[PDB]
Structures are given as C-alpha cells and as structure tokens.
Amino acid sequence: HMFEARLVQGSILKKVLEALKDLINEACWDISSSGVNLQSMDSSHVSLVQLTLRSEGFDTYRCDRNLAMGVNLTSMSKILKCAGNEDIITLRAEDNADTLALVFEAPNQEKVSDYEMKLMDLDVEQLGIPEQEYSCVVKMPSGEFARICRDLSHIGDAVVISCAKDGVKFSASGELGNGNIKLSQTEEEAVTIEMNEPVQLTFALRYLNFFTKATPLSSTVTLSMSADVPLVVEYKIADMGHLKYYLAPK
Amino acid sequence: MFEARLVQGSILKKVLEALKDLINEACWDISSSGVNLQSMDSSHVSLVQLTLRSEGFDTYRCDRNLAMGVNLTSMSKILKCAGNEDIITLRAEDNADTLALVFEAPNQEKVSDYEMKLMDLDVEQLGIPEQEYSCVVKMPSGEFARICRDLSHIGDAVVISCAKDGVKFSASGELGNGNIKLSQTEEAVTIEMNEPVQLTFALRYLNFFTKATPLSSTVTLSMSADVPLVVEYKIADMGHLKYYLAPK
Amino acid sequence: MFEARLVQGSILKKVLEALKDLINEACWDISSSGVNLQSMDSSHVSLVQLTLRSEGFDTYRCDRNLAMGVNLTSMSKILKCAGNEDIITLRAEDNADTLALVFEAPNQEKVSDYEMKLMDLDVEQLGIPEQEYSCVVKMPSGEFARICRDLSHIGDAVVISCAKDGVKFSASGELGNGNIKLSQTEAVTIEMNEPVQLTFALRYLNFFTKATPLSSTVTLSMSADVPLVVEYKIADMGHLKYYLAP
DNA sequence: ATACGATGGG
DNA sequence: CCCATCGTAT
C-alpha cells in the first residue's frame, strides 16, 4: 500500500515550499485520507505555521495508511526547483522505508523527471490548533500587506498594529523617524474589518516579512487579533486549503 | 507653514536617488518661487544644484522662507515607502524641526505619514553664475550614461573633445584605448559650439551624475576651457538638476 | 591586413560569452576560409572549437593567414561596449600586435573604436578529426541547459544513457537521486547505431550551456570510450563544439 | 549597507 | 528591446 497524490498545478506546491523554507527547515507531513496537514514552529519557537491541503484539491489522491513523513523542507524546495512551473507534480510514498518520490511530467509528456528524496526521522508531536474567534479581523489585499510590512521594516524592527471599527493602523519608529500607515475600511482589492473590541499589538517585522513570502498563493490575507494572543495571518490556497502563521506579540 | 503637494511623487523619489549617492546632507532653500538646493559632494570635487519651481507643484504654500537641513540618506529611505503612483506632500511648520511626508494612495484608502527629523544647516552655496559656454552638446541621456559606463571599463578618465560636427569621448588603460565619436544628428545629438574644447574628467563622478537619467530623456553637456563641465537634467515641468565637475 | 565586418555583432558577443568562462587565452586562426579557434580549458578536461566561415561575414578580407593570440576576458569586456544591434568590424594589420574593434551604431552617429593588445601565444590544441558517432541526440538547447542545471543540484556527475527511443540523464547525491528521461518527439531526435552510456561531469556541461543563446538546438554525439561532442550551430556562420571526455 | 551587473519578463 | 528585480561584490 502507498500514498500517491497528483497535482496538475505543480506551481502551488513550489509556492507552498517557498513560503515555508525560510521559516522552517524540517517538518512532518501528516498524510491521510482527508489530505495533507503540516504544522511546525520556527527554529526559535516564536512562530508556528500550519499548512492544510485537502484531498479534493488534488487531481488524484490515494492514501492507504496514514503516514507521518518527516521531510527536510530545504531539500524539498531544491528538488522542486527542478520542476517547471507548468509541470504536473506527483508525490508518491510507499508505506514502508524512507523515501518520497517526486515526479514532474512535462505537459508535452516527452520529458518526465523523477526525484527520490531521503525522508527524515523527525519526531514531530505537535499541538492542537482549536477553532477560535478573535477581537479584530482585518481582511486585506495581500500585496498591500506585504508592502506595508516592507516599508515599515525600513523605519523600525517592530510594527504596532492598532485596530478600530473603521480602520487599522500600522506604525514603526526608529533612527530615521516614525512611519504610520492608516488603512480605512473600503477579484480582491478592498479592506474589511470585523471587530468586536479594539486591539493594539506589536509584532516583529522580521517574522511578518517571512509570512509575506506566501503572498503568491493568495490575492488576500486575513489578520486576526486579540489581546495577549498570537496574531494569525492567513493565506487561502485556491480550492486546496490554507497556510496560517501565528506570531506572538511583543 | 510650508506645504507642497506633488501628484507625480515619482519625481521626488527620482530626485533623491540622483542626489543621495553624491550628497548625504543638504539644506533645502524653500521659498515662494520654490525649492532650491545646492551642495558639493563630500570631497568638494563637484557641486549639484536642484531647482523645483513652485508652479511644478500641484499646491505650493510658503508662508516664510526656510532653510531645511535634511539628511538625504534618511529622506531617500523614507521615499522608498512611497508608491510610484502616490501623491507626495511635504509639510513643514514654522518652529518645528521635523519634515512631514505624506503619501496618499490613488484609491485614498491607504495614507502613509512619515515624520523626519531635520538637521541644523545653512544654505551652503551661492555660486554658479550665468554664463555662455564654448560647446553645448545635447544628447539622449541613456546614450550619455552608456558612454560613461563603457569607458569606465577602459579607464578612469574620459577626454571629451568637441568640434562643430561632433563630440568624441576617449579613455585609455590596461586593456587598451576606447573612443566613442558621436556626430550631430530627445533621440538625436545637437552641438552648439562657438569655439572647440578638449577637457578631461573623472568617470567616477560622471557615473554618479548619470543616476539622474530617469528624470530626463535628454542631457545637456556645457563646456569651456579651464571651467567646470555642467551636466544638466531638465525635470518634467519643474526645473532642473545640474552637476558641475571641474576638469583635470 | 585582415578585416571582417559582421552586421549581427551580437553573435560575436555571444561567442565570447560562451568561451570566456572556459578559456582565457586563445589563438584566433584567421584565414581565407575564415576564423577558427581551438583550445583546451585550463585543466585540459575539455576542448572547444569555434568555426566562423568567411561567407557568414558581411565583408571578409584576409591577405595572409594570421595567428592572433587574444585574451578572451579582455575581448569580452571590450565587446560589452558594443550595442546588441551594432555592426562589429575586426581589423588587424599583419605586422602589428593590436586588434581593432569598431562598433557602428545602425543610425551611424555613434561610432566606437577599440584597440586591443594581442598576446604572443602558440596555437595547438590538437583538434579532433571528423567522425561518425554511435548515438546522436538532437534537442532544444534550453531543455538541455535546464537538464544540466537541475541535475547539478542533485550530483556532480550525470550518466547519459541512450537507446533507439530515448535518452536518460541521471544524477545521485546527498538529497537523493534524479532521473530525466526524454523520449523521441522544439523536439528531440535520436539517431543511434548502437546504445551508449557515458558519465560526465556536470561542472563542464554547465559551462558548455553558456553557448545556449547561439542556438535554439544542441546536438550531443556519443560513442564508447570517446569524448562527447556538444555542438551549437551559429546562424549561417558555423559552429561551436565542446568535447568532454567521459 | 550599498551600487553595479546580469537576467527574465513584458 | 527596455526595464526592474535579484544577487553579488565591494
């Protein structure tokens, strides 16, 4: 018995690994019928990323037994750089032994590449992210959000996000002076705030600017905040699932 | 208060890109006629002079003349947080030692506000009189930038020789000797010459000057014996940027 | 004097990009038939052979044969001062040690003139005589460049295996094993008399693929116990061949 | 941290 | 064929 998943849009998988490799190097892929789930904290335990790819998003998905694949994300991103952006990527793992096979098929079907990747024995054991609801939920174009985080990183190392019914404000402050970006509430080009209470948290731009490498996956990003609680930045992945990143304040 | 609104914020970004490599600190001389800036490079080899007329701005209010001392490095960094289509507004209030930059998104949902510490600085030069020059070459700026880049791969100095018909640029080094000869033709070369001239300049400086290239599709070289070269970039309905380089 | 005018100067810029990484010094063999150049890499693993026929030039005059010794690094730097649409003219006078390059702008206002110091260097890489090979693979050059780049991320050597239907490229290292299998098919063409399996160093193949801009195809010719020939044809002038020993 | 060249995309 | 972005090299 074996795991095998075929993905006609191989570029999603290349984008997902770009969005993770800077933050994590090693992660356990939790493969099952429901699909692929991945959850890891950054080397420093400051942030946690959680990937969901549903079975239905794949063109073909067979999972005979659940597996816990430990994968070096650096290696896998390297192996994915040998996939053309228009290739059909297929992942295959046989329930015994320790190797993931990647197969990149050329649309023409004259070139077929076949990589075998050494898995890791990494003993993940990771917590439960429950459903939860937050004081302010900002929804905004991801490129705007990326740009905001890049700009303010030129002023300071920390950004102070302040949210109110009408608008969210991002601020940084350093040797050059102070910056202050104030978004107001407005195929995905407008800002939307759903807020129950107001909130003002401060985060490190270094981490937010890792999160924004997910930007190619999604035209929108969702920020959820509540006091003394990690920020959730979420990128929906087409009709497959999501990528969330949690960052603790201060 | 001083306040100037500029709908084409990308000019101001470009102006600061063209200066920051050459100067780090400069006193903006703000008045009703407009903004003037004039300053030598760190080594006093070259002098740059910026003119932005009041009428080039979309709004310009100058209650009292000021001398704003601004760190160009800091201001360029702050301008990198402006989108190329943003409306930039500069605002400085009598008394305060802080320049406000405000970048407004065309959509008008995102508005950025930066506040920049000013420096205490005085309007560091007067000079650069009106004169008429022996040879005035007018040429596509990208051609001129390319010429200065190419010859910098041969030598450290370029010898510019001008005659009625044409100007010639030459350099010489370890690899050999290069020689670009332009003939008289914002896509063509034009020479207005009263006398001929042959001056030698350092390419290191000319290659700073060419960072102004984005401001203008043409550049004007004015030359006369024993006198600094003027390289001028006219700015889209606002004014100019001139750089003076002494021969050698 | 020697004098050759080339309306498509970008070929000569490309030819020097394709050689400078592999060789730094080479003797240009100028003659009536045209320009020939032949030289081994610094470590004598590989030999490159350039052919530019007299008929490919827009003008070609060679009064007597010369052996111009040229620093390819210097000449590439000088060629970087040529616009991609310029007319390049090479001129050498029999008893001078200087090559003149002249770049004319299509407009003909901008004319650049460079003079380049020649070197006094011998000439013999012994070349390779023409032969017929067991497997000849013909394929898009950018595919071949990509293949060589990809597998260089897995291993340092590639094992090229050819059969009537298809060729396979394989590499193997710390990350694991890769394996690209092309089938005969813009398109891949195999002419094979016998099957062939040789192993080459990717370090070298990846220098060879700097010729890629010269040609939309590349030809690999192989036979046992004999160097691989990778050939790039040059637009109506000739070719660039690189031989790598297994 | 900054400035230039080379590359890929439009 | 030009530009902008990345990567490098100072």
Numbering used by the authors:
A (entry chain B): 0 to 185, 191 to 254
B (entry chain A): 1 to 185, 192 to 254
C (entry chain C): 1 to 185, 193 to 253
What does the paper say about this structure?
The central channel of PCNA is a conserved structural feature among sliding clamps and is ∼35 Å in diameter, significantly larger than the diameter of the B-form DNA double helix (∼24 Å).
We obtained crystals of PCNA–dsDNA complex with one PCNA trimer per asymmetric unit and diffracting to 2.8 Å resolution. No crystal lattice contacts between DNA and symmetry-related molecules are present, and the crystal packing does not affect the DNA position. The complex interface involves the side chains of five basic residues (K20, K77, R149, H153 and K217), distributed on four α-helices of one PCNA subunit, and the side chain of another residue (K80) on the proximal α-helix of the adjacent subunit. The interacting side chains are able to switch between adjacent phosphates in a non-coordinated manner, supporting a helical sliding mechanism in which the clamp rotates and tilts by keeping a fixed orientation relative to the DNA backbone. In the MD trajectory, DNA migrates from the crystallographic position to an alternative position, and subsequently to a central location with minimal interactions with the protein, to eventually collapse into a stable state. Following this transformation, one DNA strand interacts with equivalent residues on the adjacent PCNA subunit.
